[PDB]
């Protein structure tokens, strides 16, 4: 069995072996890499996602979110309040002010201890989940708005046709952004591309031991627990590694730079911060080996998780028995 140890794989294509992106996918695996959770691809030094970022300042986020935490420094739920529209350039003036910017560090592992130490007392904006793309209609490779859809991959492997569609979503971050513990919807991989600006810390529970994450957050987080079956669903929930260790969850960490994609795999739970300003791209995709994933996925029917429109076609197919209740939390 290739990498035995769940360890994050770093890969580094060439410039052939990143004109198809399925068959890169398939070669990761065949090394092991999915069984991490989470995998980086540094792309090969010819590629470029555009020509330069100069003209992005006018993009608008349309509903920043401030994170508030709640609970101790080491095990703490967030809530997101809406907050008024603003430009990326408004945003980027208020992740460098005095209140909002990256303390003085030395290096990674200095602001990693920052940030569990102190993440719980400030309240950082996330410009997240906006719709759009950052890459070039022209770059051909790796585009994260040109993939092959999901509903395409389900109706080449179980030959149904389903509505739906699958677009890419921006992320404007700022120091303490934080993303909490959760796997994809349905358990689908996820790439993410880091366009510009400050690092992104990730940490991940290899995929064959995430049922022990879940059941030490059902301990920390009794309450959450018992009002929903899979409260990591609605996207709250934070850990440290301090705390993780401290209860023998097998979890990696790694810390992605401007330029480099990352890979979640099916039921990879994932949890991270942003170091500065910074500006990411993300979107769902699947695979073959992803079906059987798909069909096994939890989920939330308490109503808070609420998701999009696309997912229904997939609970409805591959989850039949779960389709009406699941819906009935959806209206
Ligand atoms: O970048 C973020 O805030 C969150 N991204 C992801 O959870 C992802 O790409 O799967
Ligand atoms: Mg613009
Ligand atoms: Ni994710
Ligand atoms: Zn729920």
């Given at each position: 069995?290739?990498?035995?140890?769940?360890?994050?794989?770093?890969?580094?294509?060439?410039?052939?072996?990143?004109?198809?992106?399925?068959?890169?996918?398939?070669?990761?695996?065949?090394?092991?890499?999915?069984?991490?959770?989470?995998?980086?691809?540094?792309?090969?030094?010819?590629?470029?996602?555009?020509?330069?970022?100069?003209?992005?300042?006018?993009?608008?986020?349309?509903?920043?979110?401030?994170?508030?935490?709640?609970?101790?420094?080491?095990?703490?739920?967030?809530?997101?309040?809406?907050?008024?529209?603003?430009?990326?350039?408004?945003?980027?003036?208020?992740?460098?002010?005095?209140?909002?910017?990256?303390?003085?560090?030395?290096?990674?592992?200095?602001?990693?201890?920052?940030?569990?130490?102190?993440?719980?007392?400030?309240?950082?904006?996330?410009?997240?989940?906006?719709?759009?793309?950052?890459?070039?209609?022209?770059?051909?490779?790796?585009?994260?708005?040109?993939?092959?859809?999901?509903?395409?991959?389900?109706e080449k492997e179980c030959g149904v046709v389903i509505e739906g569609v699958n677009t890419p979503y921006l992320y404007f971050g700022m120091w303490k952004t934080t993303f909490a513990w959760h796997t994809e919807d349905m358990d689908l991989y996820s790439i993410n591309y880091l366009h510009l600006g400050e690092?992104?810390?990730?940490?991940?529970?290899?995929?064959?031991?995430?049922?022990?994450?879940?059941?030490?957050?059902?301990?920390?987080?009794?309450?959450?627990?018992?009002?929903?079956?899979?409260?990591?669903?609605?996207?709250?929930?934070?850990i440290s590694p301090t705390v993780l260790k401290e209860n023998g969850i097998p979890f990696n960490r790694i810390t992605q730079e401007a330029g480099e994609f990352m890979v979640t795999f099916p039921y990879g739970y994932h949890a991270g911060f942003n170091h500065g300003f910074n500006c990411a791209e993300a979107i769902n995709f699947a695979t073959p080996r992803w079906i059987d994933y798909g069909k096994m996925a939890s989920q939330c029917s308490c109503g808070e998780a609420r998701v999009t429109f696309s997912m229904d076609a997939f609970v409805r197919i591959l989850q039949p028995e779960r389709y009406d209740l699941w819906k009935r939390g959806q209206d």
């Open positions: 069995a290739q990498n035995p140890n769940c360890n994050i794989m770093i890969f580094h294509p060439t410039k052939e072996e990143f004109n198809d992106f399925d068959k890169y996918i398939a070669y990761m695996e065949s090394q092991g890499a999915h069984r991490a959770g989470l995998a980086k691809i540094i792309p090969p030094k010819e590629w470029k996602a555009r020509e330069t970022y100069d003209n992005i300042s006018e993009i608008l986020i349309a509903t920043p979110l401030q994170q508030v935490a709640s609970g101790r420094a080491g095990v703490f739920t967030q809530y997101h309040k809406k907050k008024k529209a603003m430009t990326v350039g408004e945003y980027r003036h208020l992740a460098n002010s005095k209140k909002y910017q990256t303390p003085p560090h030395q290096n990674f592992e200095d602001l990693e201890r920052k940030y569990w130490k102190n993440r719980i007392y400030n309240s950082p904006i996330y410009g997240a989940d906006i719709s759009g793309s950052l890459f070039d209609e022209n770059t051909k490779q790796w585009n994260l708005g040109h993939l092959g859809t999901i509903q395409d991959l389900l690092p992104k810390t990730w940490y991940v529970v290899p995929p064959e031991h995430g049922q022990r994450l879940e059941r030490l957050a059902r301990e920390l987080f009794p309450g959450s627990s018992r009002g929903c079956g899979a409260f990591l669903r609605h996207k709250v929930a934070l």
